[PDB]
Design an enzyme around this catalytic site. Structure first.
Site, PDB file in Angstrom:
ATOM      1  N   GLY A   1      37.629   0.467  27.998  1.00  0.00           N
ATOM      2  CA  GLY A   1      37.904  -0.281  29.211  1.00  0.00           C
ATOM      3  C   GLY A   1      36.846  -1.308  29.490  1.00  0.00           C
ATOM      4  CD  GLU A   2      36.421  -6.500  28.934  1.00  0.00           C
ATOM      5  OE1 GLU A   2      35.703  -7.441  29.346  1.00  0.00           O
ATOM      6  OE2 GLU A   2      36.758  -6.365  27.735  1.00  0.00           O
TER       7      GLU A   2
ATOM      8  CG  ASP B   1      36.555   1.631  41.806  1.00  0.00           C
ATOM      9  OD1 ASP B   1      37.570   1.120  42.322  1.00  0.00           O
ATOM     10  OD2 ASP B   1      36.180   1.360  40.652  1.00  0.00           O
TER      11      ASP B   1
END
Ligand SMILES: C[C@@H]1[C@@H]2CN(c3nc(Nc4cnn(C)c4)ncc3F)C[C@]12NC(=O)[C@@H]1CC1(F)F
Length: 290
Positions: free
Chosen positions: A16-17, A135
């Site tokens: 992921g990024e 988050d």
């Protein structure tokens, strides 16, 4: 304290990024034989500024202190000489995030409730250590096996100060607004209760099996509209303040939807805590497991 020697790290694929971070899968092989351990490596982009560089140091520190069955395992660090920061080496969680997993695997209500419970256990733990997540979303919840879930990213996690009940945010463009409570969007303060609102959104995602057309940005942008310029957030704040909520997911029980609505009380003090949610979900899980 564990140091990973870069010479044994072999990149397999990206995991992921984000804007300032990247996670990639690596085989760590100090033999080139059949004992190779799979690891998830989080790196901070070399072009990040001092704010993110100090936030990264803090994020690394946060993961080092955290130890719980529903929190991704910290493994160690190693020198990213390319970015002149360290690299966060964690365990590789095999099935990915519930956001990647749920759309392709029709999972039962009972397993969904079990995940919900496990997320609360991991979060009540985080809050006992005086940290806010900031988050909490289905994309940040990793699936180990059909009965084991783990919170796998802490990029926004912050320490809650000594004589304070909340943290002062100073909102940015990377802020996950469609998972945010009114007090976050409006007053720029993130409470322990603010993470509970986000859990309600994560619970909605789980119950929709992370279907993209049913997603929080999709559903909220349908309600606000898109010709609304610089005002998506203001219009989101006012719809929330008018009592408007994400719809009831098809086949979601009324009691579970009531729980989601209770996590989304406009008044943060009216929301249950994660310690409060644990016995409630344990009981709702057993109920549907029958
Ligand atoms: C939980 C969220 C993503 C995925 N992460 C991980 N994914 C896995 N397993 C796995 C298997 N297939 N897939 C696709 C992913 N194991 C360990 C991980 F740490 C960490 C992560 N955080 C990030 O990617 C932030 C955004 C950034 F900075 F890169």
């Amino acid at each position: 304290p564990t140091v990973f020697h870069k010479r044994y790290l072999k990149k397999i694929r990206d995991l992921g990024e984000g804007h300032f971070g990247k996670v990639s899968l690596y085989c760590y092989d100090p033999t080139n034989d059949g004992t190779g351990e799979m690891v998830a490596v989080k790196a901070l982009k070399a072009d990040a500024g001092p704010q993110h560089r100090s936030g990264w140091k803090q994020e690394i520190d946060i993961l080092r202190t955290l130890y719980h069955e529903h929190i991704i395992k910290y493994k160690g660090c190693c020198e990213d000489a390319g970015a002149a920061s360290l690299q966060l080496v964690m365990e590789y969680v095999p099935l990915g995030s519930l956001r990647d997993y749920l759309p392709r695997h029709s999972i039962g209500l009972a397993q969904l409730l079990l995940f919900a419970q496990q997320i609360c256990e991991g979060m009540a733990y985080l809050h006992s250590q005086h940290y806010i997540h900031r988050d909490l979303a289905a994309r940040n919840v990793l699936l180990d096996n059909d009965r084991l879930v783990k919170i796998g990213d802490f990029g926004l996690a912050k320490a809650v100060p000594e004589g304070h009940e909340y943290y002062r945010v100073r909102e940015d463009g990377d802020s996950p607004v469609f998972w945010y409570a009114p007090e976050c969007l409006k007053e720029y303060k993130f409470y322990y209760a603010s993470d509970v609102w986000s859990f309600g959104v994560t619970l909605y995602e789980l119950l929709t099996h992370c279907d993209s057309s049913q997603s929080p940005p999709t559903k909220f942008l349908e309600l606000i509209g898109i010709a609304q310029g610089q005002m998506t957030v203001l219009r989101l704040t006012e719809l929330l303040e008018r009592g408007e909520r994400l719809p009831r997911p098809d086949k979601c029980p009324a009691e579970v939807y009531h729980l989601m609505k209770n996590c989304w009380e406009t008044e943060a003090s009216f929301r249950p805590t994660f310690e409060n949610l644990i016995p409630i979900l344990k009981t709702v899980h057993e109920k549907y497991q029958g």
